[PDB]
């Protein structure tokens, strides 16, 4: 399901992502635009037997388990299909432990490439939340 | 309770077609089903895949737009759709698993894209006449000519004559195939005991049994 | 993405002997996968994740390599190891390699050639096919030439080989000359001459009466 800006930003506000470590809702919604275009069921394959899952394109190597990736560490202890739900809870929860691993939101290639060092607060400018 | 697919297709160029894969027995919702294409002579090409539960699909660069996947959770079926079929889409499409719990493929669906017409075959007995002994072994076959599409099932002596048979693969010539099948018995059955070749071309409900007369 | 080239394309081995297939990637790859396909069945996953054998690969196969070069090695070649083996980089967008054919070796057999004149029945359609079976031969290679009335040739010939038998390991070829019925009765001798390693001189089989 392709979410829509403020609908997603309202549910992420709700899920405590606001100012989680030092990242305001501008960043969380920004990543979800440039990682997936807000499509909950978005998948993308990588160069090493791994897929990225959901809104926030969590990699099946380190973070979730899909049972066909090698080097699977599954650090969020979750099936990656749990990450393809139209309700952001398991995605928010694993996002917390990704942003906690001492790297901040750098783990997200598109956040790093399209949302870092810009006016990320733009992403909810005009939004109810 | 198998990874079962649909029968062979014959389709006009320009139309679309849909292959099922009644993937049954586990929690369907939970595992990716891939799809591969085999063009004989060139081999395998990976089409793409779909995770039944979420409707998530990944496609190879080449098949995005030519292929679409769907899955119906209640019959535990997954389907692939080929858009705008051409001649170069004739092949065998396989659905498969490739995870750490199972990796079974399905058996394949052949697909012929042709404007050609179902031609029933002609079956011509091949008998030697001038038996100039190679040895005391007579070989006699059946030429099955002019059918469309594949396959045919030639059989010798209604099944019994298994040893010493040789059906050669069909060759396509003028938008039609030709086949030959040999049988070899010692030169003491033929002509004394009779050899029949039973051809069946299912696609045009023909059964034929030619007997090999000298 | 990456192009996978396999070497060699056809290969042979006797039972008891050691086999190594090679697959080369145009780019570095993280893991390689091997699939085996016997004629008449869908391929089967054989080695996954570069070295791990799939459930049902006998212990006699093992595969290796990294980046650019991988390989499948069989230590004792058993008869049932004859198939095509294919490699796949199962990456962002997976590609398969060309394959490598494994045939089992045996002694150079000579083919049993046989020609059949056009049947009465096909002559009443208006065509004439002269059929020649060259059965049971090893090695696979065999050149087959046609001589309508003395020396000649023909362009509308249709050949077809069989796979290596299995209740032996032989090859068998069918060669067909299709003639139109009056190009047929405008001649006399039809000859099928085969050239195989097993003989210095061609095996020929001829007939003559299209006429009387």
Coordinates of C-alpha atoms in Angstrom, one line a residue:
Chain A
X1 CA 0.0 0.0 0.0
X2 CA 1.5 3.3 -0.9
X3 CA 1.0 5.3 2.3
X4 CA 0.8 9.1 1.6
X5 CA 3.0 11.6 3.5
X6 CA 1.1 12.9 6.5
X7 CA -0.8 9.5 7.0
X8 CA 2.6 7.9 7.4
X9 CA 4.1 10.8 9.3
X10 CA 1.1 10.7 11.8
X11 CA 1.6 7.0 12.5
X12 CA 5.4 7.4 12.8
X13 CA 4.9 10.4 15.2
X14 CA 2.7 8.0 17.1
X15 CA 5.3 5.3 17.1
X16 CA 7.8 7.6 19.0
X17 CA 10.1 8.1 16.0
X18 CA 10.1 11.8 16.6
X19 CA 13.6 12.7 17.8
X20 CA 14.6 9.1 18.3
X21 CA 18.4 9.3 19.0
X22 CA 18.7 12.8 17.2
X23 CA 16.4 12.3 14.2
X24 CA 13.2 14.3 13.8
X25 CA 10.1 13.1 11.9
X26 CA 11.5 15.0 8.9
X27 CA 14.2 12.3 8.5
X28 CA 11.9 9.3 9.2
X29 CA 9.4 10.2 6.5
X30 CA 12.2 11.4 4.2
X31 CA 13.9 7.9 4.2
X32 CA 10.6 6.2 3.6
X33 CA 10.0 8.5 0.5
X34 CA 13.5 7.9 -1.0
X35 CA 13.8 4.2 0.1
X36 CA 10.4 3.0 -1.0
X37 CA 8.1 5.8 -2.2
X38 CA 6.0 4.8 0.8
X39 CA 5.1 1.4 -0.5
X40 CA 4.8 -1.0 2.5
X41 CA 5.2 -4.1 0.3
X42 CA 8.4 -2.8 -1.5
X43 CA 11.1 -5.3 -2.1
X44 CA 14.4 -4.9 -3.8
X45 CA 17.2 -7.5 -4.4
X46 CA 20.9 -7.0 -3.7
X47 CA 24.2 -8.2 -4.9
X48 CA 24.6 -10.9 -2.2
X49 CA 21.5 -13.1 -2.0
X50 CA 19.6 -10.5 0.1
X51 CA 16.4 -8.6 -0.4
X52 CA 15.5 -5.2 1.2
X53 CA 12.0 -5.2 2.9
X54 CA 9.2 -2.8 3.2
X55 CA 8.9 0.9 3.8
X56 CA 12.2 1.2 5.3
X57 CA 14.0 -1.4 3.1
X58 CA 15.6 -3.4 5.9
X59 CA 18.2 -5.8 4.7
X60 CA 17.7 -9.5 5.2
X61 CA 21.4 -10.1 5.9
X62 CA 21.9 -8.3 9.2
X63 CA 18.5 -7.3 10.2
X64 CA 15.6 -9.6 9.5
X65 CA 15.2 -13.2 8.4
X66 CA 13.8 -14.5 5.1
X67 CA 15.5 -18.0 5.0
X68 CA 17.3 -17.8 1.8
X69 CA 20.0 -15.2 2.6
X70 CA 23.5 -16.3 3.6
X71 CA 25.3 -14.4 6.5
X72 CA 21.9 -14.0 8.1
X73 CA 22.4 -12.5 11.5
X74 CA 18.7 -11.4 12.0
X75 CA 19.4 -8.7 14.5
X76 CA 15.8 -7.6 14.9
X77 CA 14.7 -11.2 15.6
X78 CA 11.8 -10.9 13.2
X79 CA 10.6 -12.6 9.9
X80 CA 11.1 -10.1 7.1
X81 CA 7.5 -10.7 6.0
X82 CA 6.5 -9.0 9.2
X83 CA 8.1 -6.0 7.7
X84 CA 5.6 -6.1 4.8
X85 CA 2.6 -5.0 6.7
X86 CA 0.4 -2.0 6.1
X87 CA 0.8 -1.2 9.8
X88 CA 4.3 0.1 10.6
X89 CA 4.9 -1.6 14.0
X90 CA 7.6 -4.3 13.3
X91 CA 9.2 -1.9 10.8
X92 CA 9.3 0.8 13.6
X93 CA 10.6 -1.6 16.1
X94 CA 13.5 -2.9 14.0
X95 CA 14.2 0.7 12.8
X96 CA 14.9 1.5 16.5
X97 CA 17.6 -1.2 16.9
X98 CA 19.1 -0.2 13.5
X99 CA 19.4 3.4 14.5
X100 CA 20.8 2.3 17.9
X101 CA 23.8 0.4 16.5
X102 CA 26.3 3.4 16.7
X103 CA 25.9 4.7 13.1
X104 CA 22.6 6.7 13.3
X105 CA 20.5 7.0 10.1
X106 CA 23.6 6.3 7.9
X107 CA 22.6 2.7 7.6
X108 CA 20.0 3.9 5.1
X109 CA 21.7 4.5 1.7
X110 CA 18.9 6.6 0.3
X111 CA 18.5 8.7 3.5
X112 CA 22.3 9.2 3.3
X113 CA 22.1 10.1 -0.4
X114 CA 18.8 12.2 -0.7
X115 CA 17.9 13.3 2.9
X116 CA 21.2 13.9 4.8
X117 CA 22.3 17.6 4.9
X118 CA 19.1 19.0 3.5
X119 CA 16.1 20.5 5.0
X120 CA 14.6 17.3 6.2
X121 CA 11.8 19.1 8.1
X122 CA 10.3 19.9 4.8
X123 CA 8.8 16.5 4.7
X124 CA 5.9 17.4 7.1
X125 CA 5.8 21.1 6.3
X126 CA 2.0 21.6 5.8
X127 CA 1.3 18.2 7.3
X128 CA -1.2 17.5 10.1
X129 CA 0.4 15.1 12.6
Chain B
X1 CA 0.3 -30.9 -2.0
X2 CA 2.9 -30.4 -4.8
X3 CA 4.3 -27.5 -7.0
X4 CA 2.0 -28.2 -9.8
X5 CA 1.7 -26.2 -13.1
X6 CA -0.7 -25.8 -16.0
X7 CA -0.6 -27.8 -19.3
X8 CA 1.2 -26.7 -22.4
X9 CA 0.0 -23.6 -24.3
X10 CA -0.4 -22.8 -28.0
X11 CA -1.2 -19.1 -28.5
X12 CA -1.5 -16.5 -31.3
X13 CA 1.2 -13.8 -31.4
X14 CA 0.1 -10.7 -29.8
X15 CA -2.0 -12.3 -27.1
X16 CA -1.3 -12.9 -23.4
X17 CA -1.3 -16.1 -21.4
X18 CA -1.3 -17.1 -17.6
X19 CA 0.6 -20.1 -16.2
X20 CA -0.6 -21.4 -12.7
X21 CA 1.6 -23.0 -10.0
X22 CA -0.6 -24.7 -7.4
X23 CA 1.9 -24.7 -4.8
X24 CA 0.4 -26.7 -2.2
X25 CA 1.2 -28.2 1.3
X26 CA 3.1 -25.5 3.4
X27 CA 2.3 -21.9 4.5
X28 CA 2.2 -20.5 1.1
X29 CA 2.0 -17.0 2.6
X30 CA 5.5 -17.4 3.8
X31 CA 7.8 -18.3 0.8
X32 CA 9.0 -16.8 -2.5
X33 CA 8.1 -18.7 -5.6
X34 CA 10.5 -18.0 -8.4
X35 CA 10.0 -18.4 -12.2
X36 CA 12.5 -19.4 -14.8
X37 CA 12.4 -19.7 -18.6
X38 CA 14.1 -22.3 -20.7
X39 CA 14.6 -21.9 -24.3
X40 CA 16.2 -25.3 -25.5
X41 CA 19.7 -24.7 -27.0
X42 CA 20.1 -21.4 -25.1
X43 CA 19.0 -22.7 -21.6
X44 CA 17.8 -20.8 -18.6
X45 CA 16.8 -17.2 -18.0
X46 CA 15.4 -16.0 -14.5
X47 CA 12.1 -14.2 -14.9
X48 CA 11.3 -13.0 -11.4
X49 CA 9.5 -14.0 -8.2
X50 CA 6.6 -13.2 -5.8
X51 CA 6.0 -13.6 -2.0
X52 CA 2.4 -14.9 -1.8
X53 CA 1.5 -13.2 1.4
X54 CA 2.4 -9.6 0.6
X55 CA 2.1 -9.5 -3.2
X56 CA 5.7 -8.4 -3.4
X57 CA 7.4 -9.1 -6.7
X58 CA 10.9 -8.8 -8.0
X59 CA 11.5 -9.1 -11.8
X60 CA 14.7 -9.3 -13.9
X61 CA 15.5 -6.2 -16.0
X62 CA 14.5 -8.1 -19.2
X63 CA 11.1 -9.3 -18.1
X64 CA 9.7 -6.2 -16.4
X65 CA 6.6 -5.3 -18.4
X66 CA 6.6 -8.6 -20.2
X67 CA 5.7 -10.4 -17.0
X68 CA 3.3 -9.8 -14.0
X69 CA 2.8 -12.2 -11.0
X70 CA -0.3 -12.8 -8.9
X71 CA -1.1 -15.3 -6.2
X72 CA -4.4 -16.3 -4.8
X73 CA -4.1 -17.1 -1.2
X74 CA -7.3 -19.2 -1.0
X75 CA -6.4 -21.8 -3.7
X76 CA -2.6 -21.4 -2.9
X77 CA -2.0 -20.8 -6.5
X78 CA 0.5 -18.4 -8.0
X79 CA 0.1 -17.3 -11.7
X80 CA 2.5 -15.6 -14.2
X81 CA 1.2 -13.5 -17.1
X82 CA 3.1 -13.1 -20.3
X83 CA 2.1 -10.0 -22.1
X84 CA 2.1 -9.6 -25.8
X85 CA 3.5 -13.0 -26.8
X86 CA 5.9 -13.4 -29.7
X87 CA 7.7 -16.4 -31.2
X88 CA 10.7 -15.9 -29.0
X89 CA 8.5 -16.6 -26.0
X90 CA 8.2 -20.3 -26.9
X91 CA 9.8 -22.3 -24.1
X92 CA 9.3 -24.1 -20.8
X93 CA 8.4 -22.0 -17.7
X94 CA 9.3 -23.4 -14.4
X95 CA 8.1 -22.3 -10.9
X96 CA 10.5 -23.1 -8.1
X97 CA 11.5 -22.7 -4.5
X98 CA 14.9 -21.7 -3.4
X99 CA 15.0 -21.3 0.3
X100 CA 16.7 -23.3 3.1
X101 CA 13.6 -25.4 3.9
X102 CA 12.8 -26.7 0.4
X103 CA 14.0 -26.1 -3.2
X104 CA 11.6 -28.1 -5.4
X105 CA 10.9 -26.9 -8.9
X106 CA 7.7 -27.6 -10.8
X107 CA 7.8 -29.6 -14.1
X108 CA 7.3 -26.9 -16.6
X109 CA 4.7 -25.6 -19.0
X110 CA 5.7 -25.4 -22.7
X111 CA 4.3 -22.6 -24.7
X112 CA 4.3 -22.3 -28.4
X113 CA 3.3 -19.0 -29.9
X114 CA 2.1 -19.7 -33.4
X115 CA -0.4 -18.7 -35.9
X116 CA 0.0 -22.1 -37.4
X117 CA -2.9 -24.6 -37.3
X118 CA -3.3 -27.9 -35.6
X119 CA -2.3 -30.3 -38.3
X120 CA -2.9 -34.0 -37.5
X121 CA 0.0 -36.2 -38.7
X122 CA 0.5 -38.5 -41.5
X123 CA 2.2 -41.8 -40.5
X124 CA 4.3 -43.6 -43.1
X125 CA 5.6 -47.2 -42.5
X126 CA 9.3 -47.8 -43.2
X127 CA 9.9 -51.3 -44.3
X128 CA 13.1 -52.5 -46.1
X129 CA 12.0 -54.7 -49.1
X130 CA 15.4 -55.5 -50.4
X131 CA 16.6 -57.0 -47.1
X132 CA 20.4 -57.0 -47.6
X133 CA 21.6 -58.3 -44.3
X134 CA 23.7 -56.1 -42.3
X135 CA 23.3 -59.0 -39.9
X136 CA 20.2 -61.2 -39.0
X137 CA 18.7 -58.1 -37.4
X138 CA 15.8 -56.3 -39.1
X139 CA 15.1 -52.6 -38.3
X140 CA 11.9 -51.0 -39.6
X141 CA 10.4 -47.6 -38.4
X142 CA 7.7 -45.1 -38.7
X143 CA 7.9 -41.6 -40.3
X144 CA 5.3 -39.3 -38.7
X145 CA 5.1 -36.2 -40.8
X146 CA 3.4 -32.9 -40.9
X147 CA 2.0 -32.3 -37.4
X148 CA 1.6 -29.1 -35.5
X149 CA 2.1 -28.5 -32.4
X150 CA 4.3 -30.9 -30.4
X151 CA 4.1 -33.6 -28.9
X152 CA 3.4 -37.0 -30.5
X153 CA 3.7 -40.3 -28.7
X154 CA 4.9 -43.1 -31.1
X155 CA 4.8 -46.4 -29.5
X156 CA 5.9 -49.7 -30.9
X157 CA 3.8 -52.8 -30.8
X158 CA 1.4 -51.2 -28.5
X159 CA 3.9 -50.9 -25.7
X160 CA 5.5 -54.3 -25.7
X161 CA 8.3 -53.5 -28.0
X162 CA 10.4 -51.4 -25.7
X163 CA 13.9 -52.8 -26.2
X164 CA 15.4 -51.5 -29.4
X165 CA 13.2 -48.6 -30.0
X166 CA 14.6 -45.2 -31.0
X167 CA 12.3 -42.2 -31.4
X168 CA 14.3 -39.4 -32.7
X169 CA 13.2 -35.8 -31.7
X170 CA 11.1 -33.9 -34.0
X171 CA 12.5 -31.4 -36.4
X172 CA 10.5 -28.4 -37.5
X173 CA 10.7 -27.7 -41.2
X174 CA 7.8 -25.7 -42.9
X175 CA 6.0 -24.7 -39.7
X176 CA 5.4 -28.4 -39.1
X177 CA 7.4 -31.2 -37.4
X178 CA 8.7 -34.6 -38.6
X179 CA 9.6 -37.5 -36.4
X180 CA 11.0 -41.1 -37.0
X181 CA 11.0 -44.0 -34.5
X182 CA 13.0 -47.4 -35.1
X183 CA 12.4 -50.8 -34.0
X184 CA 14.9 -53.7 -34.3
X185 CA 13.9 -57.3 -33.9
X186 CA 15.9 -60.4 -35.2
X187 CA 15.1 -61.3 -38.9
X188 CA 12.8 -64.1 -37.8
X189 CA 9.9 -62.0 -36.4
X190 CA 9.4 -59.8 -39.4
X191 CA 7.6 -60.7 -41.4
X192 CA 6.3 -63.8 -39.4
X193 CA 5.0 -61.9 -36.3
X194 CA 3.7 -58.4 -36.9
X195 CA 5.0 -55.0 -35.7
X196 CA 2.7 -52.1 -35.3
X197 CA 3.6 -48.5 -34.5
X198 CA 1.0 -46.6 -32.5
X199 CA 1.2 -42.8 -33.0
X200 CA -0.9 -40.4 -30.9
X201 CA -1.0 -36.7 -31.4
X202 CA -3.2 -35.6 -28.5
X203 CA -3.6 -32.0 -29.7
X204 CA -5.7 -33.2 -32.7
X205 CA -7.2 -36.4 -31.2
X206 CA -5.6 -38.8 -33.7
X207 CA -4.7 -42.3 -32.9
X208 CA -3.0 -44.4 -35.7
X209 CA -1.5 -47.8 -35.8
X210 CA 0.3 -48.7 -39.0
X211 CA 1.3 -52.3 -39.4
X212 CA 4.7 -52.9 -41.2
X213 CA 3.9 -55.1 -44.2
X214 CA 6.7 -56.1 -46.5
Chain C
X1 CA 23.9 -8.7 -14.3
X2 CA 27.1 -10.6 -14.7
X3 CA 27.8 -12.8 -17.6
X4 CA 28.7 -16.4 -16.7
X5 CA 30.7 -18.4 -19.2
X6 CA 31.2 -22.2 -18.7
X7 CA 34.0 -24.2 -20.0
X8 CA 33.9 -26.7 -21.6
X9 CA 30.5 -27.0 -23.2
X10 CA 30.5 -30.8 -23.9
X11 CA 32.7 -33.1 -21.9
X12 CA 33.1 -36.8 -21.3
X13 CA 34.3 -39.1 -18.6
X14 CA 34.4 -42.8 -17.7
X15 CA 32.9 -44.2 -14.5
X16 CA 35.5 -44.2 -11.7
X17 CA 37.3 -41.0 -13.0
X18 CA 37.5 -37.3 -11.8
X19 CA 35.5 -34.4 -13.3
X20 CA 36.0 -30.6 -12.9
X21 CA 33.6 -28.1 -14.6
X22 CA 34.5 -24.5 -14.7
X23 CA 32.2 -21.3 -14.6
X24 CA 33.7 -17.8 -15.0
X25 CA 31.9 -14.6 -13.9
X26 CA 32.5 -11.2 -15.7
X27 CA 32.3 -9.6 -12.4
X28 CA 33.0 -10.6 -8.8
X29 CA 30.1 -12.5 -7.3
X30 CA 29.5 -13.4 -3.6
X31 CA 28.1 -16.9 -3.9
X32 CA 27.6 -19.3 -7.0
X33 CA 24.8 -21.9 -7.4
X34 CA 24.8 -25.0 -9.4
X35 CA 21.8 -26.8 -10.9
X36 CA 21.8 -30.1 -12.7
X37 CA 19.3 -31.1 -15.4
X38 CA 18.9 -34.6 -16.9
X39 CA 17.0 -34.9 -20.2
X40 CA 13.3 -35.0 -19.6
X41 CA 13.1 -33.5 -16.2
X42 CA 13.2 -29.9 -14.6
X43 CA 16.7 -29.0 -13.2
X44 CA 17.4 -29.7 -9.6
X45 CA 19.5 -27.6 -7.3
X46 CA 22.7 -29.3 -6.7
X47 CA 25.2 -27.0 -5.0
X48 CA 23.9 -24.0 -3.2
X49 CA 25.8 -21.2 -1.5
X50 CA 29.0 -22.0 -3.3
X51 CA 29.9 -25.2 -1.4
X52 CA 26.8 -26.6 0.3
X53 CA 25.3 -29.7 -1.4
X54 CA 21.5 -29.8 -1.6
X55 CA 19.5 -32.5 0.0
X56 CA 20.2 -35.5 -2.2
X57 CA 23.5 -34.6 -3.8
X58 CA 25.8 -37.6 -3.1
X59 CA 28.9 -36.7 -1.2
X60 CA 31.1 -37.3 -4.3
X61 CA 30.3 -33.8 -5.6
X62 CA 31.9 -30.7 -4.1
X63 CA 32.1 -27.1 -5.5
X64 CA 34.4 -24.1 -4.8
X65 CA 36.0 -20.9 -6.1
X66 CA 35.6 -17.1 -5.3
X67 CA 34.9 -13.9 -7.2
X68 CA 35.6 -14.9 -10.8
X69 CA 36.3 -18.7 -10.8
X70 CA 34.1 -21.4 -9.4
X71 CA 34.0 -25.2 -10.1
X72 CA 32.0 -28.4 -9.6
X73 CA 34.2 -31.4 -9.0
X74 CA 33.2 -35.0 -9.0
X75 CA 35.8 -37.4 -7.6
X76 CA 34.5 -40.9 -8.8
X77 CA 32.4 -40.3 -12.1
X78 CA 29.4 -42.5 -11.6
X79 CA 27.1 -43.1 -14.6
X80 CA 24.2 -41.1 -13.1
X81 CA 26.4 -38.0 -13.1
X82 CA 25.6 -37.4 -16.8
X83 CA 23.6 -34.4 -17.3
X84 CA 24.0 -30.8 -17.9
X85 CA 25.3 -28.8 -15.0
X86 CA 24.5 -25.0 -14.9
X87 CA 25.9 -22.2 -12.7
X88 CA 23.9 -19.1 -11.6
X89 CA 25.0 -16.0 -9.8
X90 CA 21.9 -15.4 -7.8
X91 CA 22.3 -11.7 -7.5
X92 CA 20.3 -8.5 -8.0
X93 CA 19.3 -9.9 -11.3
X94 CA 20.3 -13.5 -11.6
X95 CA 21.9 -15.0 -14.7
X96 CA 22.6 -18.6 -15.6
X97 CA 25.7 -20.0 -17.3
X98 CA 25.7 -21.8 -20.7
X99 CA 26.0 -25.3 -19.1
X100 CA 28.5 -28.1 -19.5
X101 CA 27.3 -31.5 -20.8
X102 CA 28.6 -34.6 -19.2
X103 CA 28.5 -37.7 -21.4
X104 CA 29.9 -41.1 -20.2
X105 CA 32.6 -42.7 -22.2
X106 CA 32.8 -46.0 -24.0
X107 CA 34.6 -47.6 -26.9
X108 CA 34.2 -46.3 -30.4
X109 CA 31.3 -48.2 -31.9
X110 CA 30.5 -48.3 -35.6
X111 CA 27.0 -47.2 -36.7
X112 CA 24.5 -49.7 -38.2
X113 CA 23.2 -47.6 -41.2
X114 CA 19.8 -48.5 -43.0
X115 CA 17.9 -46.8 -45.8
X116 CA 14.2 -47.0 -46.6
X117 CA 12.7 -46.0 -49.9
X118 CA 9.6 -43.7 -50.1
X119 CA 6.5 -45.6 -49.1
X120 CA 3.6 -46.2 -51.6
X121 CA 1.4 -44.3 -49.4
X122 CA 3.6 -41.2 -49.2
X123 CA 4.1 -41.4 -53.0
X124 CA 0.3 -41.1 -53.3
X125 CA 0.5 -37.8 -51.4
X126 CA 3.0 -36.5 -54.0
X127 CA 6.1 -36.5 -51.9
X128 CA 8.9 -38.9 -51.3
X129 CA 11.2 -39.1 -48.3
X130 CA 14.1 -41.3 -48.3
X131 CA 15.0 -42.2 -44.7
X132 CA 18.3 -43.4 -43.3
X133 CA 18.8 -44.5 -39.7
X134 CA 22.5 -44.7 -38.5
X135 CA 22.0 -46.5 -35.2
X136 CA 24.2 -47.2 -32.2
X137 CA 27.6 -45.3 -32.5
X138 CA 30.2 -43.7 -30.3
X139 CA 31.8 -40.9 -30.7
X140 CA 28.9 -38.6 -31.3
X141 CA 30.4 -37.2 -34.6
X142 CA 29.4 -38.7 -37.9
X143 CA 29.1 -36.8 -41.2
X144 CA 26.2 -38.1 -43.4
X145 CA 26.3 -37.3 -47.3
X146 CA 23.7 -37.9 -49.9
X147 CA 24.2 -39.0 -53.5
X148 CA 21.2 -38.9 -55.7
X149 CA 22.2 -40.7 -58.9
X150 CA 25.8 -40.9 -58.7
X151 CA 27.5 -37.9 -57.1
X152 CA 25.4 -35.0 -56.0
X153 CA 24.2 -33.8 -52.6
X154 CA 20.9 -32.0 -51.5
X155 CA 19.9 -28.9 -49.5
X156 CA 16.5 -30.2 -48.0
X157 CA 18.0 -32.8 -45.7
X158 CA 16.7 -33.1 -42.0
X159 CA 18.9 -34.7 -39.5
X160 CA 18.2 -35.5 -35.9
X161 CA 20.4 -37.2 -33.3
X162 CA 19.4 -39.0 -30.1
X163 CA 20.7 -38.3 -26.7
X164 CA 23.3 -40.9 -25.4
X165 CA 21.0 -44.0 -25.0
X166 CA 21.4 -44.9 -21.2
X167 CA 21.1 -48.7 -21.5
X168 CA 24.5 -48.3 -23.1
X169 CA 26.0 -45.0 -24.1
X170 CA 25.5 -44.7 -27.8
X171 CA 24.3 -42.0 -30.2
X172 CA 21.9 -42.6 -33.2
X173 CA 21.1 -40.2 -36.1
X174 CA 18.2 -40.1 -38.7
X175 CA 18.8 -38.3 -42.0
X176 CA 16.0 -37.5 -44.4
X177 CA 16.0 -36.5 -48.0
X178 CA 12.6 -35.1 -49.0
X179 CA 11.9 -35.1 -52.6
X180 CA 8.9 -34.1 -54.5
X181 CA 7.4 -37.2 -56.3
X182 CA 8.5 -36.4 -59.9
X183 CA 12.0 -35.3 -58.8
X184 CA 12.0 -38.7 -57.2
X185 CA 10.9 -40.6 -60.4
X186 CA 13.3 -38.6 -62.5
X187 CA 16.2 -40.5 -60.9
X188 CA 17.4 -44.0 -59.8
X189 CA 20.2 -44.5 -57.2
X190 CA 19.9 -43.0 -53.7
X191 CA 22.9 -43.4 -51.4
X192 CA 23.5 -42.7 -47.7
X193 CA 27.2 -42.5 -47.0
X194 CA 28.4 -42.2 -43.5
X195 CA 31.8 -41.1 -42.3
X196 CA 32.7 -42.2 -38.7
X197 CA 36.0 -42.4 -36.8
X198 CA 35.6 -46.1 -36.6
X199 CA 36.2 -46.4 -40.3
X200 CA 38.7 -45.4 -42.7
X201 CA 36.2 -45.7 -45.5
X202 CA 32.6 -44.6 -45.5
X203 CA 29.8 -47.0 -44.7
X204 CA 27.3 -46.7 -47.6
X205 CA 23.8 -48.0 -48.1
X206 CA 22.1 -47.6 -51.6
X207 CA 19.0 -48.5 -53.5
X208 CA 18.0 -47.8 -57.1
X209 CA 14.4 -48.4 -58.4
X210 CA 12.4 -45.4 -58.4
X211 CA 12.0 -46.6 -62.0
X212 CA 11.8 -50.0 -63.5

